[PDB]
Design an enzyme around this catalytic site. Structure first.
Site, short mmCIF file in Angstrom:
data_model
loop_
_atom_site.label_atom_id
_atom_site.label_comp_id
_atom_site.label_asym_id
_atom_site.label_seq_id
_atom_site.Cartn_x
_atom_site.Cartn_y
_atom_site.Cartn_z
N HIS D 141 12.66 -24.91 -11.55
CA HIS D 141 11.19 -24.88 -10.99
C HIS D 141 12.17 -23.51 -9.23
O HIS D 141 11.86 -22.79 -8.38
CB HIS D 141 10.92 -25.51 -9.11
CG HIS D 141 9.94 -26.42 -10.55
ND1 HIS D 141 9.03 -26.43 -11.21
CD2 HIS D 141 10.40 -27.90 -10.47
CE1 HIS D 141 8.26 -27.64 -11.57
NE2 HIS D 141 9.26 -28.66 -11.58
N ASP D 178 10.81 -30.64 -19.36
CA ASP D 178 10.16 -31.89 -17.92
C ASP D 178 9.01 -31.73 -17.87
O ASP D 178 7.50 -30.95 -18.76
CB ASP D 178 10.76 -31.09 -17.08
CG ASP D 178 10.96 -31.17 -16.14
OD1 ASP D 178 9.77 -30.88 -15.40
OD2 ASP D 178 11.67 -31.73 -14.91
N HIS D 180 6.53 -31.46 -15.82
CA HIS D 180 6.17 -29.86 -14.44
C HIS D 180 6.37 -29.00 -15.01
O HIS D 180 7.41 -28.48 -15.69
CB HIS D 180 6.59 -30.25 -13.71
CG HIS D 180 6.53 -31.87 -12.30
ND1 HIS D 180 8.05 -32.95 -12.63
CD2 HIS D 180 5.57 -32.14 -11.87
CE1 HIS D 180 7.33 -34.16 -12.09
NE2 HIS D 180 6.08 -33.42 -11.47
N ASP D 266 10.79 -37.27 -17.07
CA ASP D 266 9.41 -37.45 -16.00
C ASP D 266 8.18 -37.55 -17.12
O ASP D 266 7.38 -38.03 -16.89
CB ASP D 266 9.85 -36.98 -14.92
CG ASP D 266 9.81 -35.56 -15.04
OD1 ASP D 266 9.96 -34.70 -16.00
OD2 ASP D 266 9.83 -34.46 -14.35
O1 LIG Z 1 10.82 -30.63 -11.93
C1 LIG Z 1 10.28 -31.88 -10.42
C2 LIG Z 1 9.90 -31.32 -9.36
C3 LIG Z 1 9.21 -32.32 -9.04
C4 LIG Z 1 8.50 -32.24 -8.00
C5 LIG Z 1 7.46 -33.38 -6.87
C6 LIG Z 1 7.01 -32.86 -6.01
C7 LIG Z 1 5.89 -33.31 -5.30
C8 LIG Z 1 5.51 -32.39 -4.10
O2 LIG Z 1 5.02 -31.33 -4.12
N1 LIG Z 1 5.29 -33.08 -2.78
C9 LIG Z 1 4.89 -32.66 -1.59
C10 LIG Z 1 4.07 -31.74 -1.18
C11 LIG Z 1 3.47 -31.80 0.16
C12 LIG Z 1 3.99 -32.11 1.08
C13 LIG Z 1 5.47 -32.97 0.80
C14 LIG Z 1 5.72 -33.68 -0.25
N2 LIG Z 1 10.79 -32.55 -10.34
O3 LIG Z 1 11.95 -32.50 -11.95
K LIG Z 2 7.80 -28.29 -18.30
ZN LIG Z 3 10.11 -32.53 -13.77
#
Ligand SMILES: O=C(CCCCCCC(=O)Nc1ccccc1)NO
Ligand SMILES: [K+]
Ligand SMILES: [Zn+2]
Ligand SMILES: O=C(CCCCCCC(=O)Nc1ccccc1)NO
Ligand SMILES: CCCCCCCC(=O)O
Ligand SMILES: CCCCCCCC(=O)O
Ligand SMILES: [K+]
Ligand SMILES: [K+]
Ligand SMILES: [K+]
Ligand SMILES: [Zn+2]
Ligand SMILES: [Zn+2]
Ligand SMILES: [Zn+2]
Lengths: 366, 366, 366, 366
Positions: D141, D178, D180, D266
């Site tokens: 990311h 992944d 995401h 995940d």
């Molecule tokens: O690739 C990834 C990234 C996963 C991230 C998911 C997190 C969710 C998120 O954005 N939560 C959030 C939003 C607003 C305020 C607090 C937390 N993980 O493997």
């Molecule tokens: K992906």
């Molecule tokens: Zn992920």
């Protein structure tokens, strides 16, 4: 009747990502379990057991009233309080020495302090005979302008100055049996004769290296501060003798109008943050000695304020026996560690050493 | 050259659902963090720090060889081993006194025991100069027929009996500085002169109430068991004098062909399961005394076997300083607790008491 | 007035040493964090938030009264109850399929069941208008003779049979929106027309492979069981349509004298034990639909009974919005996940598939 | 010969005091267990199982060498790197969107990045046939100037730019499974034809609301970015078809000289951070499809880089089957969740919807 002063949000204070008391980073690996030393459960589990035993149903639980800024600034400069709020709004920090907090820790500290204020207020008003304030964060290391040792506000001093402003009380004695030195309480009233500050603590533990028997006050306060350092490894009989030979005689001479116990439970036999050997029945008896002193000296007026205590598994039994004594209520709780902790107690050679140690402290008091 | 004997699966042993060492149920609320007292991380965090420092790359790490049933039955009756396996297959249990285990605990105990067997074997065969076995579960409370105090197999006695069978070694000394009494080792060799068993331990701690200085062996083993109880609250200087005045002279008199240290790290200053004040440099210095003894008496042949240690945040620094001494390696690790633990150390009055205590032990030995 | 039925001891139930729902042993390494899937905090954190928001102060919290043996034996054979009590007394175990418990789990299950009994009893007697029972352990998978899926007693059926014996209520509807199939409720009333059992659940999730739309009851109960499987990945709009098109018309047709919601919160968007995409405002809306239904059909008599829910961080916000709806109260709580969970919702192609799915279930109902 | 690239200190990165991914404070109560979502154990438990099975002994584990400042600045502006280091030196923080780190998090991110750099380097130099890099923190990311979603450096893009400098490689394909969206990888190479970036991800999950099938690159990169959004609730058969109908044909057309898999685990059936239904045998099969593609297209040159994955109990079995495939080794590990996860898989109506969804993606590709 016993008042019990607690609020859910005191268990939401978080010191942050530490392994025990060690900040994460450099050579300190993050913990995989609960972070920190002052954990929420090291205090909540006491309340949990008092619910489970039926004891809480015998007590009165007023709704919490947070300290106001006017309240806390009877002790702290407004500049410290303002910086605390700004840092808390910004995500947390540490404005002193080993006193970390997270976002919103300011509001939770104000709330915790208000439990001590209200416990003292309600005892002085006659609303309850005695009271227990389950403060978290704790207070007895906090200096007027410097938080320290997990203490962000001077809970007990603020409660005393509020009581002076509201009720005009003349003499207050603080008996600090948290295992660490109550350096905050000592400092705040060091030159005053209207507050007797007594601390029983493990010699040299926290603040590290400090013993303090010779530090007896200054000016008008000379004779109104009393440190009882005890050697690492002291247990039930050593604490009983220190209370019989030093603490209770000091209270009798001072003639307080209110007794406040700064009750940390970290002298218990399995605490990681000290080396003492108290057990649940030690806390029952020490509480009974203070109930007796308050009955004799100040019409039963006794307030117990939670400070330290870090053994999540054993603190509940120590605090529960204390609460049974304070409230005069019997429950079916049985301390499963007590038989072993009694077997752990110092043998005769160590017992003679502890007795000689306390005799010397008495002799030095002249 | 230092050999380091470890296996991933030793960190998979689980004592079960306990709050610290208290089984859940009745008045003991389940823990929200890591269950138990002998947690995986209370041992793995030592290995983790030695990886992170670069120390592990300077050691040699043989692939683990589990104990065989023939090995362990040189100490234990086959009936106990059979019941252990059956209970472990059936989901775990506790066949002794405070020795709980989970499903598959039998295989992990056999693996752990094999780390001690192989560490002794490799030192005696000259593959390494000295060795450290990261055993978990521990061994030094286990009796021949009864597991006890988190110990399911008698790791060091089994490794000794294997070395006698494979190498014919004549005299072995065991120096047990785990904070608790090595009652398993004492019992198994109590009537034997070929194994000198020395235990330094907190007076009356575990087994509870036991001190034991008068228990010096029986029959041919009279004079070949040596208990050094130390008072709760003793620290660095007390342990150093106990080693200079009792332990090292006993080793000199016995003339071992191999020294094995039963090394628990639970005398450290923040352990929940004892009341002692050792710090990381205490373990470095005690290890140097054992390296010197082995150099003088048995060609450097020294094996260190992990036993207890329960402070997850501080055990790694104590064990890492020990491993640096054993291996003679320098790293950039700095103990962040050391300055405070030095300030915690007993002052002059307690120090005189500790010297009087050790002088009495020496006098009683004649 | 909304009644809230809870007891501290429900948080002391412990499933034992599992990694999530996986028993330790073989290839499953013990967890270093909280053990289990049905953790104490996965339920307590809802209560904690309701305290912190001030919502608990707006509710009435009666003291818990445990289920009697007579109560539970209206559903369960005495042999099961006796073996449960005996196993619990001896240290815990598992008498069914994925239903482990610790020492004393029997008394805690009887207490949890009493929360549901009292919630139904007090709504039927008019002491409260509606009620929430924070049951733990849950009940909706428990068969008459076999516990399963973290459920040790059939909480809701026991509360129903008790209500029939004490109030003679004629028709009860159970709306089960826990994400798993309420196979226990379905089985216990399958041949009965006086209890309408509706389950909305993830298709094939638990019991694994089960969908069940064609299982409509038997004998007199034909037409009085209603399974609404929904595909994994269904979210807010899918559940709302399922309630508008299937659940609420079935309630209207059945004319209940009381509606009971089996409320698991594990359809929430981050639950590990299912694949659904509900958020906190989904639970507010679905609760409002049940309030409207109860207002229209049975004088407002609505009881909500906690079942599953495993995302410790998000279950609190989902249950808190539910409680706001139930009590008609608003608090300052803001769900910090809501915006993201709204962005997560199925897009137009998935939404058309969900409408096609629900339309097929409607067509099959004839 | 399979290389496995890991370092102990990757498990010491700590995102801080969050309940799952929610920062504590306001309405989010601190967790009592392990803090955070990207927990150390969510990655270490895979390594642990690979040790316990004996598989690690079949791999080659080179010593980690961190990324240099020159390495990371082929992708990131020096200003970002300097602010990262300064913030990390000063106690940690968060320089982006959901990318918190603790003190010393900079060094650990550079170390993690070096694992990916070395894995690519050693495969291209022929030291190993293929490689697995256990990166933590993850990378996919992270934008050139903005860390995001637990990713602090662009691990895979940095490894690619290092390979172009060191080996002059012309074409690289990244297959990101992944769960995401790999928005970092997509952004960094969006206008470049020498790197094909493919991302299979849950529709609208993270970044929230993003699908992206129409974003195919720009300028010279038009046609060299390929997003494969899949509906929540998709499982084994849907991923297999996406790889057969979209991913593998894209690889065959592009003719890469190296294939890198951005492997998050995940999409597993019990992950809290997505809604997909993959199981351990899904990852074995997808890895085999990538092995087959690399053997067909680029002489076996395949690198797998760990990204996300949050189900501590099930990630190990998913990654372990991946590692078995990658290395061509068999072990005695048996996935105890496999049978249930197979029963959880979408039934015929959902399967037809997934097939229609993937047919539509293919049609839109023209
Ligand atoms: O690739 C990834 C990234 C996963 C991230 C998911 C997190 C969710 C998120 O954005 N939560 C959030 C939003 C607003 C305020 C607090 C937390 N993980 O493997
Ligand atoms: K992906
Ligand atoms: Zn992920
Ligand atoms: O050598 C050892 C064994 C330490 C054992 C510590 C004492 C624990 C104990 O006795 N616990 C207990 C007591 C009463 C009831 C239940 C548990 N550890 O290193
Ligand atoms: C031992 C290092 C930190 C100790 C803090 C003591 C606070 C208390 O009085 O509980
Ligand atoms: C293994 C996945 C499901 C286990 C049982 C869940 C019980 C419930 O909450 O209804
Ligand atoms: K004190
Ligand atoms: K010992
Ligand atoms: K359901
Ligand atoms: Zn203290
Ligand atoms: Zn020990
Ligand atoms: Zn459920």
């Amino acid at each position: 009747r016993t008042g019990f002063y607690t609020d859910e949000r005191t268990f939401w204070h978080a010191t942050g990502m530490q392994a025990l008391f060690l900040p994460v980073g450099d050579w300190v690996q993050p913990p995989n379990g609960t972070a920190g030393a002052d954990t929420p459960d090291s205090k909540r589990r006491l309340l949990n057991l008092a619910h489970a035993s039926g004891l809480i149903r015998k007590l009165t639980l007023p709704e919490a009233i947070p300290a106001t800024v006017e309240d806390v600034c009877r002790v702290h400069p407004r500049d410290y309080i303002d910086r605390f709020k700004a840092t808390s709004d910004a995500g947390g920090g540490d404005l002193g020495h080993l006193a970390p907090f997270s976002k919103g820790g300011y509001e939770i500290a104000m709330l915790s302090c208000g439990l001590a204020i209200a416990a003292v207020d309600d005892v002085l008003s006659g609303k309850v005979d005695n009271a227990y304030a389950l403060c978290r964060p704790a207070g007895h290391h906090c200096l007027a302008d410097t938080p320290m040792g997990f203490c962000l506000l001077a809970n007990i001093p603020i409660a005393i100055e509020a009581a002076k402003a509201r009720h005009g009380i003349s003499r207050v004695a603080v008996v600090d049996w948290d295992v660490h030195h109550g350096n905050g309480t000592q400092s705040i009233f060091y030159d005053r004769a209207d507050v007797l500050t007594i601390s029983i603590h493990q010699d040299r533990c926290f603040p590290p290296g400090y013993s303090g028997a010779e530090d007896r006050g200054e000016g008008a306060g000379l004779g109104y501060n009393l440190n009882v350092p005890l050697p690492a490894g002291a247990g039930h009989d050593a604490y009983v003798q220190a209370f019989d030979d030093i603490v209770v005689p000091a209270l009798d001479d001072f003639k307080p109008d209110l007794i406040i116990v700064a009750s940390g439970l970290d002298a218990n036999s399995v605490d990681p943050l000290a080396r003492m050997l108290l057990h649940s029945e030690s806390y029952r008896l020490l509480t009974q000695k203070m109930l007796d002193a308050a009955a004799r000296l100040c019409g039963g007026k006794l307030v117990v304020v939670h400070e330290g205590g870090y053994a999540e598994a054993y603190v509940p039994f120590c605090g529960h026996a204390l609460l049974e004594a304070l409230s005069g209520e019997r429950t079916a709780v049985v301390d499963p560690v007590l038989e072993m902790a009694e077997a752990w107690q110092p043998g005769p050679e160590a017992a003679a050493f502890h007795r000689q140690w306390i005799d010397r402290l008495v002799a030095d008091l002249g």
